[PDB]
Amino acid sequence: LTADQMVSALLDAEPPILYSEYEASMMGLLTNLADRELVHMINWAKRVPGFVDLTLHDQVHLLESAWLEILMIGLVWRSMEHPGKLLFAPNLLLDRNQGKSVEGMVEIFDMLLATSSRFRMMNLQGEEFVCLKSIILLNSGDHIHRVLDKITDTLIHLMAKAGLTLQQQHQRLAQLLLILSHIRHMSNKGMEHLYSMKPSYDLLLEMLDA
Amino acid sequence: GSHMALSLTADQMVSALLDAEPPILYSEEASMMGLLTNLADRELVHMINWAKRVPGFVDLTLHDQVHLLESAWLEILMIGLVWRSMEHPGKLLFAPNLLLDRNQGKSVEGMVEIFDMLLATSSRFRMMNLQGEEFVCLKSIILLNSGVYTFLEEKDHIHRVLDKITDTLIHLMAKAGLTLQQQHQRLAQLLLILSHIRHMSNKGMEHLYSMPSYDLLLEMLDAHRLHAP
Numbered sequence: 039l040t041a042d043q044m045v046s047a048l049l050d051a052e053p054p055i056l057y058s059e060y061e062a063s064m065m066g067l068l069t070n071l072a073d074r075e076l077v078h079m080i081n082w083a084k085r086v087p088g089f090v091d092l093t094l095h096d097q098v099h100l101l102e103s104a105w106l107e108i109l110m111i112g113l114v115w116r117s118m119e120h121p122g123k124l125l126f127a128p129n130l131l132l133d134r135n136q137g138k139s140v141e142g143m144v145e146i147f148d149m150l151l152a153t154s155s156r157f158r159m160m161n162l163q164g165e166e167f168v169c170l171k172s173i174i175l176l177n178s179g180d181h182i183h184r185v186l187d188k189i190t191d192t193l194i195h196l197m198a199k200a201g202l203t204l205q206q207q208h209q210r211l212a213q214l215l216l217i218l219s220h221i222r223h224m225s226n227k228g229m230e231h232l233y234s235m236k237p238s239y240d241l242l243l244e245m246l247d248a
Numbered sequence: 249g250s251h252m253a254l255s256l257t258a259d260q261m262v263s264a265l266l267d268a269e270p271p272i273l274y275s276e277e278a279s280m281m282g283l284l285t286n287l288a289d290r291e292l293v294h295m296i297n298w299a300k301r302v303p304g305f306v307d308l309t310l311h312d313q314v315h316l317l318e319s320a321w322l323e324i325l326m327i328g329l330v331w332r333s334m335e336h337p338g339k340l341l342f343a344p345n346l347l348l349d350r351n352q353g354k355s356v357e358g359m360v361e362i363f364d365m366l367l368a369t370s371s372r373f374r375m376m377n378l379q380g381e382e383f384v385c386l387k388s389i390i391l392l393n394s395g396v397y398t399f400l401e402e403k404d405h406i407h408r409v410l411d412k413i414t415d416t417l418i419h420l421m422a423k424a425g426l427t428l429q430q431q432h433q434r435l436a437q438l439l440l441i442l443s444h445i446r447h448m449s450n451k452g453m454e455h456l457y458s459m460p461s462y463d464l465l466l467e468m469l470d471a472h473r474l475h476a477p
């Protein structure tokens with residue numbers, strides 16, 4: 039794949055924006071939405087170049103490690119145009135105060151809002167976003183490393199076509215990748231919260247093995 | 249005289265970071281945990297001295313300095329550990345007199361998973377032939393990045409300093425003989441390892457709460473004003 043073919047393949051693989059159903063009410067709605075987004079995520083993963091070249095075991099491990107980071111990056115991306123709010127769905131736009139209804143949720147909401155504001159301030163583009171989402175999938179858990187190098191080349195190509203100087207290109211690449219450390223942190227805090235009040239192997243395996 | 253962070257050339261940045269480097273300390277299942285806790289506490293004191301010398305860090309308010317150190321202290325201890333453990337495959341060089349293999353971690357409940365992650369990180373840095381000058385840049389990035397979007401002109405300042413550190417990393421790779429494409433690929437590889445260091449710190453923090461607060465760090469950062477030069 040050329041950088042242009044990589045971009046086209048990632049944009050074409052994009053999952054759809056889902057709608058919510060119709061504290062306890064909010065948690066139920068958010069859980070149901072996450073479960074429905076997960077099914078589309080498996081189908082998206084299968085279309086990421088290089089992902090199907092991996093063994094079923096490697097595919098399962100990468101998705102098991104990255105699913106929350108991928109849900110979170112998708113959330114923060116569609117929430118960019120809504121300062122102070124999280125656009126879980128077009129019919130479920132929640133502010134900080136609504137996160138205070140559930141114990142331990144306000145901290146995660148605050149981190150997601152801060153990430154959305156950073157992407158807004160950076161003017162993150164759709165083509166950069168799909169590259170970042172693919173990196174999260176391949177990195178969160180030699181061929182994988184060669185594919186990651188190809189995504190970096192693709193990110194640079196996008197910035198060069200956008201008219202950034204050679205210096206601006208490395209500075210922007212670094213700024214984008216550093217936010218991935220923040221997304222990892224949020225996923226770890228989210229996973230901790232899930233185990234405090236407790237998406238299965240069968241779900242991933244049935245969809246990954248036809 | 250005093251160089252402002254944004255005025256530094258790549259060479260001045262490297263010299264400032266190398267000069268700020270903390271020393272390698274010596275060590276003093278219950279005995280093992282005590283030794284590692286005591287070592288971490290002693291490394292923390294040197295870490296405050298190091299942080300104060302990281303260009304741009306003293307331009308921040310005392311409250312912002314504490315917020316950054318509170319978020320980054322374990323990532324900084326971990327990156328230091330993985331760096332000095334590079335020349336020792338299968339072992340973690342906590343101190344020259346405390347070199348531990350993964351089997352030793354098995355003596356403490358939940359410790360093996362963290363040791364395995366630290367060992368994997370050390371092997372990745374060895375395979376990439378991480379240089380001392382790149383390492384100091386990475387440690388500085390961890391400090392300035394780990395708490396920025398966890399708290400306009402002051403936030404922009406941190407981001408401008410981070411850009412200066414990236415420019416420094418690129419300069420080092422360019423002088424090492426890497427093509428422009430190879431520089432971008434190496435930079436990306438290194439920054440992706442930072443997401444793994446964040447992961448390890450989160451898992452490490454979780455283990456601590458199962459078994460350095462804002463107040464403790466605030467007092468240590470403030471007490472630095474009283475130390476002799």
Ligand SMILES: CC(C)(F)CN1[C@@H]2CCC[C@@]1(c1c(F)cc(/C=C/C(=O)O)cc1F)c1[nH]c3ccccc3c1C2
Nearest residue numbers: 065068069071072075109110113146228229231232237
């Ligand atoms: C997982 C955790 C603790 F970080 C909270 N999450 C973040 C905040 C909103 C609730 C949600 C969440 C979840 F991601 C998963 C579950 C799962 C339950 C079960 O399996 O029983 C329950 C949640 F509340 C969730 N929902 C989403 C939908 C679209 C896009 C993003 C999200 C997120 C991010």
